Amino acid sequence: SGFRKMAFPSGKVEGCMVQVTCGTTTLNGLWLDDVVYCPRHVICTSEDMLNPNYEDLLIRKSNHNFLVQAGNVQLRVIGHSMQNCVLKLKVDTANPKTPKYKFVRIQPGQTFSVLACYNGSPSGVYQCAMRPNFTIKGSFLNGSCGSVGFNIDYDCVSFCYMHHMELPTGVHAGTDLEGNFYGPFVDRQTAQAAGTDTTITVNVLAWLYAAVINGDRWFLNRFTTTLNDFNLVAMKYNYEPLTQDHVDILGPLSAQTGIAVLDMCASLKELLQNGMNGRTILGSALLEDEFTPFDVVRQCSGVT
Amino acid sequence: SGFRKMAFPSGKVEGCMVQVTCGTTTLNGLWLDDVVYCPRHVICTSEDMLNPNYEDLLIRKSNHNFLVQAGNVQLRVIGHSMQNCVLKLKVDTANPKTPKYKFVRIQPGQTFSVLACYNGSPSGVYQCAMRPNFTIKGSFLNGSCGSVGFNIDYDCVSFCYMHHMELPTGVHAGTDLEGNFYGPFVDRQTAQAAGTDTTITVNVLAWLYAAVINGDRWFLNRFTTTLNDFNLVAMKYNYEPLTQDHVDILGPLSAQTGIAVLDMCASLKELLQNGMNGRTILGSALLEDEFTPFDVVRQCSGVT
Ligand SMILES: *CC(=O)N1CCN(CCNC(=O)c2cccc3ccccc23)CC1
Numbered sequence: 001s002g003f004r005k006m007a008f009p010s011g012k013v014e015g016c017m018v019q020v021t022c023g024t025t026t027l028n029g030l031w032l033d034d035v036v037y038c039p040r041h042v043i044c045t046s047e048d049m050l051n052p053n054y055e056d057l058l059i060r061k062s063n064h065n066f067l068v069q070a071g072n073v074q075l076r077v078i079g080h081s082m083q084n085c086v087l088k089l090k091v092d093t094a095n096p097k098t099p100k101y102k103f104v105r106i107q108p109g110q111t112f113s114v115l116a117c118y119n120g121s122p123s124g125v126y127q128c129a130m131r132p133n134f135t136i137k138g139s140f141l142n143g144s145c146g147s148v149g150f151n152i153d154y155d156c157v158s159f160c161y162m163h164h165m166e167l168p169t170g171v172h173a174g175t176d177l178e179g180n181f182y183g184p185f186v187d188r189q190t191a192q193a194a195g196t197d198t199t200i201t202v203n204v205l206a207w208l209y210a211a212v213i214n215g216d217r218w219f220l221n222r223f224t225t226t227l228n229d230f231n232l233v234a235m236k237y238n239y240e241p242l243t244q245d246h247v248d249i250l251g252p253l254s255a256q257t258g259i260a261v262l263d264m265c266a267s268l269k270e271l272l273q274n275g276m277n278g279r280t281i282l283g284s285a286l287l288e289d290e291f292t293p294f295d296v297v298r299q300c301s302g303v304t
Numbered sequence: 305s306g307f308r309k310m311a312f313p314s315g316k317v318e319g320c321m322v323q324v325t326c327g328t329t330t331l332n333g334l335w336l337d338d339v340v341y342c343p344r345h346v347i348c349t350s351e352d353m354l355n356p357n358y359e360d361l362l363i364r365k366s367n368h369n370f371l372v373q374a375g376n377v378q379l380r381v382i383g384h385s386m387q388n389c390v391l392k393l394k395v396d397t398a399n400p401k402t403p404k405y406k407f408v409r410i411q412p413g414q415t416f417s418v419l420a421c422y423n424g425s426p427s428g429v430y431q432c433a434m435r436p437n438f439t440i441k442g443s444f445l446n447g448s449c450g451s452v453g454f455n456i457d458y459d460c461v462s463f464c465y466m467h468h469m470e471l472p473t474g475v476h477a478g479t480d481l482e483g484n485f486y487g488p489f490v491d492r493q494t495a496q497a498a499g500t501d502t503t504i505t506v507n508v509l510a511w512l513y514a515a516v517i518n519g520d521r522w523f524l525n526r527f528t529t530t531l532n533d534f535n536l537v538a539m540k541y542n543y544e545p546l547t548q549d550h551v552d553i554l555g556p557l558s559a560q561t562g563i564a565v566l567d568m569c570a571s572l573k574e575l576l577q578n579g580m581n582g583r584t585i586l587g588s589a590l591l592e593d594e595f596t597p598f599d600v601v602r603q604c605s606g607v608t
């Protein structure tokens with residue numbers, strides 16, 4: 001037993017990280033097969049931050065201007081193209097460590113692991129969630145752009161995120177591996193403010209089930225609620241509305257614990273209204289929302 | 305910017321995980337060079353849980369009774385020996401993926417990453433701290449024994465922990481890689497209760513410095529304190545006493561932020577006495593103590 005914020009093992013993704021330099025800018029690239037994916041802003045100077053015209057800036061770049069280094073070995077760039085906000089650098093060598101992979105575009109509320117990198121070198125791994133306002137709360141310094149987010153299904157890595165920027169509020173924005181930003185963000189240093197960072201209700205409920213499974217039960221009460229009643233309280237507390245789809249997704253956890261989903265909603269409703277009163281749930285003094293129901297089942301069952 | 309509970313990249317350790325089966329018991333082993341390290345309780349049945357005599361149980365075990373599998377390939381066991389609470393299974397093949405490594409015995413308050421494994425297969429990675437009562441708060445189900453804790457210094461993995469057991473309170477106990485338990489715990493299913501789980505004061509202070517660096521500054525106050533005054537409050541709140549050594553260790557963070565260590569102690573003192581008042585620091589509603597000052601510097605500087 002015990003329940004931790006756990007990331008996927010990062011080895012399969014470490015084997016894909018390369019350094020990409022264009023002029024004075026160095027960031028990370030993701031090397032899969034014979035293609036290196038990286039943020040297109042690698043071609044920008046600090047001068048081009050306000051209003052970059054990427055097609056125009058790219059005309060001045062040739063294959064030999066993109067320096068790609070895998071470990072201490074240089075890769076030969078034989079083609080380059082821009083797809084949305086990412087560049088795809090075709091190299092003459094397929095990555096010998098390319099895992100089975102997919103490019104997926106996740107929905108808000110979904111979690112993933114990030115392998116934070118600097119100069120093509122992995123520094124750490126942590127678990128994130130795509131927030132309902134399409135930002136992520138990561139840990140990214142200068143040089144971390146091009147670090148990726150992913151999930152693993154046994155031996156297949158599903159890449160879902162590539163880091164591009166930090167908003168002036170300290171939250172992060174990026175793209176899927178087709179180069180499309182999550183949310184309304186753009187790769188421009190301009191006034192971009194995030195919307196409401198609502199709490200992912202279905203994830204909090206999943207985490208309350210994890211708490212019960214792992215012995216933390218104090219918050220269980222004698223009440224029940226309905227989706228409509230619960231949602232009036234959820235709206236008041238800036239929680240995402242709970243749908244019948246979320247109830248169905250929590251079905252296996254409800255079966256395992258014998259606690260009906262709406263009864264867990266009533267426990268959550270009292271926690272929202274009454275607070276924790278200085279108590280903790282799974283070592284947390286707030287309601288954790290960065291575990292999906294799948295993460296809870298995975299961690300509670302021991303999926304490898 | 306942004307500050308996350310980050311684990312080290314786990315690839316170097318994934319390359320070392322093997323499955324070890326003895327009779328009906330399957331757990332994990334750590335394969336370094338031509339030796340596989342695993343908990344000696346792999347030789348126990350559920351029957352032997354109350355009072356195992358490991359020397360006696362081991363007499364009935366031969367090299368061919370220890371089934372070691374690396375991926376889908378069996379390893380040949382050519383010797384076995386018991387060192388404290390671990391078994392060392394000599395195999396005929398050196399692990400080709402053996403990283404540069406050290407075996408270190410950590411002190412309470414020190415953090416490390418755990419690669420949770422089942423049947424020799426990695427399931428996830430998370431960051432832990434050796435608690436002042438010599439337990440860890442992990443995430444370990446049946447089959448996770450033999451999973452290891454480690455730190456990485458550039459390319460050298462320092463293994464500090466191997467998982468052996470769960471106390472009836474849900475907290476975890478294990479050994480260093482020489483097989484010596486941290487704290488007073490034994491590999492016996494008996495009444496073993498943990499002592500006071502005090503808060504690692506120097507780590508909370510380090511995390512308050514990380515908060516200031518990353519923009520969360522509301523808790524900064526107009527006060528200062530002394531080590532003695534601070535420690536009267538720390539004792540009252542079950543915090544570890546702060547020493548001049550801890551003050552010296554926080555020196556670089558104090559220099560970076562311009563906030564004297566004793567001034568940060570006075571901020572911590574008011575947080576202890578007044579609580580958070582429903583506010584958060586780095587997304588936490590409690591004072592986080594599982595980041596050492598070295599972790600904060602590492603994460604804030606971008607060490608790879
Ligand atoms: C996150 C990261 O590693 N970055 C790479 C280095 N840049 C500095 C130079 N680039 C910019 O200032 C710049 C220019 C155009 C557009 C953007 C968009 C997002 C971030 C930076 C941008 C900082 C980011």
Ligand SMILES: *CC(=O)N1CCN(CCNC(=O)c2cccc3ccccc23)CC1
Nearest residue numbers: 345348350352353446447448449469491492
């Ligand atoms: C953590 C883990 O994966 N374990 C391996 C499987 N055992 C079940 C069988 N072993 C015991 O019940 C047993 C016997 C003797 C001594 C101990 C000491 C600690 C834990 C189990 C023990 C459970 C643990």
